[PDB]
Each structure stands twice: as structure tokens, then as C-alpha cells.
Amino acid sequence: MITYVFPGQGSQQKGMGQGLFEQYQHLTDQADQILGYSIEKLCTEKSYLDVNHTEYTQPALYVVNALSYLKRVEETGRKPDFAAGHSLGEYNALMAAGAFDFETGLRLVKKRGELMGRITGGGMAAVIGLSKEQVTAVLEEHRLYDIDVANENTPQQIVISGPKKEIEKARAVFENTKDVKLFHPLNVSGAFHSRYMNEAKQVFKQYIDSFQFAPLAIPVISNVYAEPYHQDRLKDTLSEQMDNTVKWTDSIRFLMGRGEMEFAEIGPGTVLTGLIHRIKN
Numbered sequence: 001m002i003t004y005v006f007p008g009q010g011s012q013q014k015g016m017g018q019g020l021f022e023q024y025q026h027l028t029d030q031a032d033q034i035l036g037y038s039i040e041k042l043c044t045e046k047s048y049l050d051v052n053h054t055e056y057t058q059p060a061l062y063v064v065n066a067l068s069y070l071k072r073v074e075e076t077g078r079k080p081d082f083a084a085g086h087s088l089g090e091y092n093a094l095m096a097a098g099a100f101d102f103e104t105g106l107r108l109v110k111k112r113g114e115l116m117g118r119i120t121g122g123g124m125a126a127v128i129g130l131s132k133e134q135v136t137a138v139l140e141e142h143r144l145y146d147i148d149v150a151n152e153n154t155p156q157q158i159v160i161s162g163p164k165k166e167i168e169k170a171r172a173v174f175e176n177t178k179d180v181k182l183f184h185p186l187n188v189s190g191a192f193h194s195r196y197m198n199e200a201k202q203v204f205k206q207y208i209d210s211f212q213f214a215p216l217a218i219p220v221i222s223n224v225y226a227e228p229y230h231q232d233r234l235k236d237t238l239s240e241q242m243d244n245t246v247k248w249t250d251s252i253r254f255l256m257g258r259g260e261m262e263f264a265e266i267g268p269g270t271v272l273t274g275l276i277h278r279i280k281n
């Protein structure tokens with residue numbers, strides 16, 4: 001058994017998906033027309049749009065993952081038994097699983113990127129060394145009720161999310177707690193995957209409802225439940241994702257429980273392979 005997993009924000013990098021664009025020139029052209037710019041140039045030319053700006057990152061990641069998948073499947077002959085993606089990457093898993101088509105995913109992640117891109121006054125930080133239980137305790141003991149858990153990445157990598165000044169207060173807390181190895185603020189200015197994504201979540205819910213969704217060929221493990229998408233709640237499970245924890249350690253657990261399980265990371269970088277190794281350890 002094998003699982004294809006799709007990376008999210010932080011895996012992009014100029015040169016990503018080099019040579020795959022002209023191989024799927026229809027998809028590239030379709031992406032160009034939906035986006036209003038050259039998706040090949042976003043991905044691979046240092047002279048054009050900065051791929052690190054979330055509004056562009058998500059379409060860049062989404063297109064590169066999509067195409068990397070089509071190539072893998074063509075090349076191995078094998079379609080995966082499960083699919084999962086981290087935050088942005090979930091949209092590649094639903095799409096590979098047949099929930100919607102290339103175009104539909106890209107429209108979705110364009111609006112995702114744009115809405116995420118206007119979020120302001122926020123901050124996220126990775127805390128390494130403590131459990132999600134432990135992070136929760138400390139947050140509260142120290143009266144930081146404003147910070148949410150945005151990412152459960154390994155059993156001891158937790159990303160926190162809140163107002164900018166709140167992330168700064170927590171620095172002092174986490175860097176003076178036993179078992180914390182690292183506090184590393186993320187290079188973002190929105191409190192993603194937290195209560196502060198509320199209005200954006202909604203605006204984005206209404207957008208999701210506007211599309212017709214197909215049934216899944218592959219089981220997709222949801223970021224929100226660490227469980228497979230229940231086929232009747234597809235839109236609801238996806239719309240719940242914006243302002244809820246990415247439950248990634250547990251989504252990788254569920255897949256290990258499924259049998260003798262292989263993971264392959266489709267898309268740029270080895271970020272998820274990393275998290276999978278540490279979850280497996």
C-alpha cells in the first residue's frame with residue numbers, strides 16, 4: 001500500500017516543476033487563463049512574480065503538485081491507495097482523488113490564496129520539543145488564550161497561530177519551558193488555521209458551495225479530522241479546513257495503521273517526507 005502526499009506553503013522554490021509545464025501545455029494554458037499570469041514563469045523564472053507571496057504560492061504549488069502527480073502516475077502506472085495534502089496540498093489530494101478537476105482546484109486555490117493573502121496583523125510560530133497537549137497547557141497556564149494550534153506536524157512539532165504581538169509574548173514562554181528545543185516564528189503575516197481565519201473561512205465556504213463536487217476514486221485523509229473524507233460531507237470537510245488545525249501527525253498515523261504503508265511526496269521539496277520520518281520514528 002502507498003499514499004501520495006502533497007506539500008503546502010514552504011515547499012515552493014523557483015525552478016519547481018521545471019519542464020513539466022510544456023508536457024501538459026493544455027493545463028498550463030488553462031492555469032494561465034484562470035490566473036491572469038504565466039504559471040510557468042511564476043514557478044521557474046527569477047525575473048518574474050515572487051513565488052513566496054501566498055496569493056501566488058498556492059496556485060504555484062497546486063499546479064506543480066497536480067502535474068508532478070499526473071507524471072508520477074503515468075510513469076509508474078500506479079495510482080495511490082490514499083492521498084493527503086498539507087493545508088494547500090489537500091486540494092491536490094481531492095483533485096487526484098477525483099473530487100473536482102484541475103481547473104476547479106486552481107479556481108479554489110486562487111481564491112484561497114487571495115483571501116489568505118489579505119490577512120494581516122497575524123503571526124505563526126513553530127514550537128519544537130513539546131506535544132500538542134503540552135503546548136495547550138503552556139499556552140493556557142501563561143494566559144495566552146488568543147493563540148490557536150494551527151499545525152500538528154509531528155508528535156513534537158506544533159505550529160501556533162494568533163495576533164502578531166501574541167506570538168511575540170509566547171516566545172518568552174516557550175523559550176523558558178523544559179523540553180522546548182526551538183521557537184521559530186514563521187515568515188507569514190496572517191494567523192492561518194486559527195479562529196482569526198473565521199470571516200475568510202466563511203467567504204471561502206460560500207465559494208466552495210458554488211462548485212459541483214464528484215465522488216472520490218481514492219480515499220483522501222482530511223486535514224481537519226485525520227480521517228478519510230466521508231463522501232457526503234466533502235464540501236463541509238474542506239470548508240472547515242481554513243480555520244482549524246492541520247492535523248497532520250494523526251493523518252499520517254491513520255495511514256500507518258492502514259497496513260504496510262509507503263509514502264511518496266509528489267510536488268517540490270522533501271518537507272513532508274521529513275515530517276513523515278519523524279512521525280514514523
Ligand SMILES: [Cl-]
Nearest residue numbers: 256257258259
Ligand atoms: Cl485495518
